Design a protein around this ligand. Structure first.
Ligand code: 0H1
Ligand code: 0H1
Ligand code: 0H1
Ligand code: 0H1
Ligand code: FBP
Ligand code: FBP
Ligand code: FBP
Ligand code: FBP
Lengths: 319, 318, 324, 318
């Protein structure tokens, strides 16, 4: 019942645990970045560019998250969609955490104003040798914290840690993320499937037959609903809230899927498992995949357990 | 040389003679659209969840209703959220009929997916005293029509005889900034939009069209698939990037789902004033004369060439 | 009755009079600049000046950016011909493409000299009409305040409020920073006939002529054995004048030695607040004549001003009438 | 390199080890201030005037209250708006005592004058059970104090033993941005501030001192009068531009009007830390042992040389 905010949640789960403060401040700083990304995505100031005072979003998001993570004095390696190679933090500002993020996911189609988001996934540095790109190559199992911000009909940050998955709604009136769902867990089975079917020609037989099973029920029930926005963050958030399954399977145009492991697949897979769901690559679990490159693509099928398991059974049959 | 909706709306009105009522209708309407935005972005949510201690469908409809009522430019008012028509009280009557969906796609509003307002303004056909028949005009007679997208940012799209204009809201000052003038649509796209969870129930014409897209017949490249589940969001994508949108008829919806007067007709008028088309398969959406204010209709809108590619497949199976 | 926004009220009243629509157009563009000023004064985006994104239009002083906003909104309205401002020594003649009927005199950000202490500041405006038959010039701004089509201010205080005086009367609108509309909160307001506040800079006590020095003692030591008036001086005209509109009372900025002909500017401070006051049942006097009756010879002309509640202003006037 | 208050209030804590409770207090306090600013600037005023169909003292108090109880860092809470010391429920208790005025100057708020939230943080010293007594500490024992000014913009002024620090609220992101660091006051000023309507009732000492500033002794230049009527507003001017602020004993209030624990004592700590001075004419405001939570006190604060000059005149007449 009693109120609580994202700032207080992270400075109290971090308070009530050892207390180095770096991860508290990293997350602290990270929401402040997201709040700034939100106002820019809501186009708050477009009038000054169009002549109110008189005579980039994907780039600006990357700058904000980087800048802030750097100033947090808690990051040593930083991997992003935009920056090809990793970003080794200047000595002065280094901490002990490796952060992998997609600063604006879906801005390929931001000109139609579709829901976009910010995906993040925090690792701690295991190695002793001087920081490097290779420190980002940890398996998804090793995620200290992951989550995503959604810039949709409203802004929401979904934080996943060992203590569970907690969903915060940005009240733009006060500039504060408000806790509106505690320790969320996904439905066991849903009525929704999320898939780009223009690649129907190029599907695995198992993916094809699972969709046929959903479209044309094999147990004389009701067919599922198709819901594909075109931005992972939105579809996954629906898959959390409403239940169901999300699929970006391996094609032939993309033999390894399209969604990147380190900063797209793994963070969403962590959120799913920490909330009673599951995510798999078909053959191995997304979190158990060991990266060899930081921009490594991966197939990913995440969502409600009784559905992903149904998929997985069909994967047995077609392998 | 900044050009706001409120400025646009009274120069296009002055550039079209006439009283000034429609300007003040669109002013009141967009003021309500600004207040829907505020609630949809969840401003004040902390007070509900107990920052001091201790519904959107309805709120959105109340905002639109009170604003259009107070505008002195409405006689009949038709909404999703009202089974009957709203005969505006005589002291506040105007010369226009507004058919609107206050918040479209709110069924799945809890996933925080793009919702929107849809509207379409007619001019009274009445001679004496208004009635719900004034809303029962074909889409061809639409004075003005458009929508507002509460997505990545809030955009009002306004189609009129002078064309389709897109205004971005600037939340900092609450002004709609003209960012796209007289918009026209790609002649053909690589996007298709429908709910394939009804594939069991689709017409043979529909099914073949999708096979043509999933499996190009001319050995080109397969089209793309996008169904947000919200008409504003899908229509606006079909406007911006191009492509095709369908919510066709099937056996368990012989008349589609999407309503005529406050969903299909408004989006058809946008598309046709932007160079796209909009058909039910047999008539064009704007050419259906309604019999019921909550009448349902099939809709296949989008880029011109794409709807033509459909209509050829449709005629073959009929 | 029902909700109303500044936007309809302006374009409603501008249709109840047929009318060109320029005044409506002007009042809108002026409004839109006012919301813009408010958002900058509330320091929105101050974080992008302090390294939020790392590196970089508006590294401007707020009083300048305000002026630029009001200017580039007014010119673009196609309703203005001559524009007078405090931040401009000469009147701005609008280009022949965007010329209109009305002459506007304004103070973009009044009180910004102490905006460091975050004091209430505001935008004072006043709309005349070109009465001249010849091309626009700084002469056209030299009209008496009697010839005001409309006047008012926007107070950027605990909240942002636009006060609009016309022949209608005075109409108070509050900005809802959520939706970005001015909401009609008070309609056709009038001032309290008499009040219990007095407002002036008593640091200039050494240079007060006897009329002021007596009246002030009549308030601190009342003659009728009643109760002393309260002393209230923000140091920002929009602030003190607005309090005098809501609570009643009196506001004085008179003749000194340092500035013997007043300080407060006539065309874009005194005259507009006099129109507000007179249209709301109050008075505004120079001591000699009434403020609205003063005949300008220069655009940046100063003037002594004593405005406020009717009984209060007249009480002072009897005291000045003893000394002349 | 940006510095927010959520960073600063944690950095200082980490540097002093400490549980994390003074941090959470202030972090929770600031969210309350962010919410009060929203209310004061009239966000949602449209809905009170019927945009969709059809108190601030109390809301501000409820906000501070509920946020501080939720902080898990308070045991005793003292406010204007409750004639009682509020003792926090055992499950939500910390070790600090907060004496606060949630909205000061809202007396004269219909004219929209600058208002503000004043606060001061003590630490429970009695081994006893949390009670009103724990708040009756002299201001000297203060861990932290300050105020939130809701004027031109919103600023949180935060005084501690690491100096006084000013934080500007950026409504675009809801973040208090550090803009003036380790601030310090001019040793002498040119501005004076008091209600001269109470002239008939002032100390002969006060009356001389004002003469001494209105008509200078060294026939130099006079000071400038500035009385807003909101202590936060006047005091913040006196922090920035310098000068003096008085609310001395007249007769209707012969022991001052301004409340010691939650009006005078917090402002004294700010001045003190920023190199200023704050006296009752007898003793330092921080050195007044309180008897009642709502106890009033004569307050004279500002630039040190100017406060001393008043004190010189006081000693003559005393
Ligand atoms: C609910 C989990 C949680 C949440 C927050 N929070 O802020 O909500 C936290 N904040 C902080 C902080 O002190 O900054 C911590 C530190 C604890 C920690 O995880 N150490 S470790 O990297 O796994 C490690 C690497 C090698 C040996 S132990 C923390 C933990
Ligand atoms: C570009 C199209 C356009 C746009 C706007 N706008 O505001 O962007 C308009 N505003 C208004 C207004 O009246 O203010 C108009 C007049 C509309 C109207 O009168 N239609 S009619 O009753 O069938 C009729 C009466 C007499 C002859 S035709 C208008 C038109
Ligand atoms: C209630 C007072 C009031 C308020 C507003 N308002 O919008 O707050 C106005 N807006 C406009 C406009 O047309 O812009 C007007 C008319 C301006 C005008 O035409 N003056 S005139 O040539 O001597 C004349 C001809 C015919 C009648 S008066 C107007 C008037
Ligand atoms: C003034 C510097 C400063 C600022 C903040 N801050 O929040 O910016 C702090 N936060 C916390 C925390 O507990 O997290 C501390 C330590 C706890 C504490 O000060 N205990 S004390 O007996 O009152 C005491 C007074 C002096 C030495 S120790 C802290 C300290
Ligand atoms: O258009 P496709 O091939 O279905 O790709 C969809 C996927 O691409 C993405 O948009 C990748 O995001 P961006 O390329 O815009 O950064 C996913 O969010 C989304 O799930
Ligand atoms: O789930 P379905 O059957 O595909 O329906 C989706 C369609 O219905 C709508 O959601 C209509 O809005 P509501 O369902 O929220 O009333 C369209 O926006 C949308 O395109
Ligand atoms: O210094 P003084 O004599 O108090 O002058 C105060 C007057 O100067 C002004 O501040 C003039 O405005 P500026 O601060 O922009 O110069 C008036 O608003 C105000 O009433
Ligand atoms: O009417 P007065 O005596 O000048 O009172 C002014 C003083 O009273 C106060 O308003 C007391 O606070 P309140 O407004 O909450 O009663 C101070 O803020 C202010 O400095």
């Amino acid at each position: 019942t009693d109120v609580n905010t994202l700032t207080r949640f992270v400075m109290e789960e971090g308070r009530k645990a050892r207390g180095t403060g770096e991860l508290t401040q990293l997350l602290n700083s990270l929401c402040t970045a997201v709040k700034a990304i939100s106002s820019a995505v809501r186009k708050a100031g477009i009038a000054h560019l169009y002549g109110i005072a008189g005579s980039k979003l994907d780039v600006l998001s990357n700058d904000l998250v980087m800048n802030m993570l750097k100033s947090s004095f808690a990051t040593c390696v930083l991997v992003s969609e935009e920056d090809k190679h990793a970003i080794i933090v200047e000595p002065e500002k280094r901490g002990k955490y490796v952060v992998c993020f997609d600063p604006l996911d879906g801005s390929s189609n931001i000109d139609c104003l579709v829901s976009v988001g910010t995906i993040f996934g925090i690792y701690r540095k295991k190695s002793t040798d001087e920081p490097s790109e290779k420190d980002a190559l940890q398996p998804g199992r090793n995620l200290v914290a992951a989550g995503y911000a959604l810039y949709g009909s409203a802004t929401m940050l979904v934080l996943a840690m060992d203590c569970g998955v907690n969903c915060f709604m940005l009240d733009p009136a006060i500039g504060e993320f408000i806790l509106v769902d505690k320790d969320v867990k996904i439905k066991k089975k849903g009525k929704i499937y999320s898939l780009n079917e223009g690649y129907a020609r190029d599907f695995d037989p198992a993916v094809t037959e699972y969709i046929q099973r959903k479209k044309f029920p094999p147990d004389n029930s009701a067919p599922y609903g198709a819901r594909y926005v075109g931005s992972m963050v939105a579809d996954v958030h629906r898959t959390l809230v409403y239940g169901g399954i999300f699929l970006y399977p391996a094609n032939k145009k993309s033999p390894n899927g399209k969604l990147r492991l380190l900063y797209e697949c793994n963070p969403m897979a962590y959120v799913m498992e920490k909330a009673g769901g599951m995510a798999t690559t078909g053959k191995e679990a997304v979190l158990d995949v060991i990266p060899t490159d930081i921009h490594q693509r991966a197939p990913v099928i995440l969502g409600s357990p009784d559905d992903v398991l149904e998929f997985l059974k069909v994967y047995e049959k077609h392998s």
